[PDB]
């Protein structure tokens, strides 16, 4: 069997990986590290008018989540960017120019969702890189599928990665898991090798 | 004994439950998921005037935690709503109409508190449901006691739950654990079955 000291080592290593942003890979799309969205190059935000911000009871304005939130680590239910329908896109200026090796997408767990269903999750998606920061025509880096029956956090490795560098990338959502009104993106990460 | 593979499975399952809001139950009182307080139907906030917000050194206004914070997941010391004395109440519009099956209350751990005491914690409490959203007379769903000697997060199952649905609920604090000035509520959750 295993010894007591061995069990403690296994637990220590597991919690250290947990504390390293769960997956232990640097994220060049993290907003606090220097990444940002290019708002004019994202899908229109799904505006719902169900959340009202006020002062002293007097109405003010509606509350909605902007594309910035896909670059932010809080992923409690509703801390997600929504666009209308099952196709949408977001363009991100990474914090540094890198050779991308993987991306990570996550969604809220089924256990924290009504009826244990996450139909607003992205399904098929594609990642594009823009060699020149201001060019409008991107290069396909990879196509993947977020598995609604998989772990909440899923990492996707570029199958045959072609080592040039990029600082501007696009997350293009092609389908969702069946929600008839919107698609929700909780957090998008980009991993790779710096210069 | 146990095998190495078995230890890894146990740790994996434990961290997955940890990541699912610690308890793996959807929370219909979570603000980001669509819940909100009815401010005119909560206790007056304990206002202390010890926290001053300013700009360039010029005084501005006092900082205090509103009842919204009981619907928010950050539970570091002081990220709690306080009311004066040992009796108080908060009314919450849940994110959906549900059949309530349990509630969860948590407090800061003794280890993070001076003298390892949490006398501001709620003690005896009761949960009421308001069948019609605008009615002022509630139905008792259950009476429980938060155990200051128990785990920081405590879940309470409605002992004989009587399946109608509610969207408006009240947390009524009847006693606290002895603090002579105030009672502090860190986070309140409501669990149940949607329609």
């Amino acid at each position: 069997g295993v010894t007591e000291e061995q069990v403690h080592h296994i637990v220590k290593d597991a919690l250290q990986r947990y504390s390293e942003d769960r997956i232990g890979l640097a994220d060049y799309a993290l907003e606090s590290g220097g990444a940002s969205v290019i708002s004019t190059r994202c899908s229109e935000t799904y505006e719902t008018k169900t959340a009202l911000i006020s002062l002293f009871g007097i109405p003010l304005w509606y509350h909605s989540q902007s594309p910035r939130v896909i670059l932010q680590p809080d992923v409690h239910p509703g801390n997600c960017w929504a666009f209308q329908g099952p196709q949408g896109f977001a363009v991100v200026r990474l914090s540094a120019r890198i050779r991308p090796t993987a991306v990570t997408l996550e969604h809220v767990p089924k256990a924290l969702s009504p009826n244990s269903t996450i139909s607003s999750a992205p399904k098929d998606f594609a990642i594009f890189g823009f060699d020149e920061d201001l060019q409008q025509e991107g290069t396909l880096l990879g196509k993947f599928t977020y598995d609604q029956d998989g772990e909440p956090i899923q990492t996707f490795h570029f199958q045959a990665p072609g080592r040039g560098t990029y600082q501007v990338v696009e997350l293009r959502i092609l389908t969702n898991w069946g929600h008839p009104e919107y698609t929700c993106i909780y957090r998008f990460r980009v991993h790779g090798e710096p210069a | 004994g146990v095998t190495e593979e078995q230890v890894h499975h146990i740790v994996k399952d434990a961290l997955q439950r940890y990541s699912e809001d610690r308890i793996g139950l959807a929370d219909y009182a979570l603000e980001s998921g669509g819940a909100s307080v009815i401010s005119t139907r909560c206790s007056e906030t304990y206002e202390t005037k010890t926290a001053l917000i300013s700009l360039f050194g010029i005084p501005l206004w006092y900082h205090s935690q509103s009842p919204r914070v009981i619907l928010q997941p950050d539970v570091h010391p002081g990220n709690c709503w306080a009311f004066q004395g040992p009796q108080g109440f908060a009314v919450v519009r849940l994110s959906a109409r549900i059949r309530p099956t349990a509630v969860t209350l948590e407090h800061v751990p003794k280890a993070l508190s001076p003298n390892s005491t949490i006398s501001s914690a709620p003690k005896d409490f009761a949960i009421f449901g308001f069948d019609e959203d605008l009615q002022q007379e509630g139905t008792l769903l259950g009476k429980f006691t938060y155990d200051q000697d128990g785990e920081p997060i405590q879940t309470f199952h409605f002992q004989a739950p009587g399946r109608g649905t509610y969207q408006v609920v009240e947390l009524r604090i009847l006693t606290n654990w002895g603090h002579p000035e105030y009672t502090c509520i860190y986070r309140f959750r409501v669990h149940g079955e949607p329609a």
Partner: peptide
Amino acid sequence: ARSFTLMLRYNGPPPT
């Protein structure tokens, strides 16, 4: 000056 809080009210579920 006085105390203070933005208030948030939902009349329907936000996207999740």
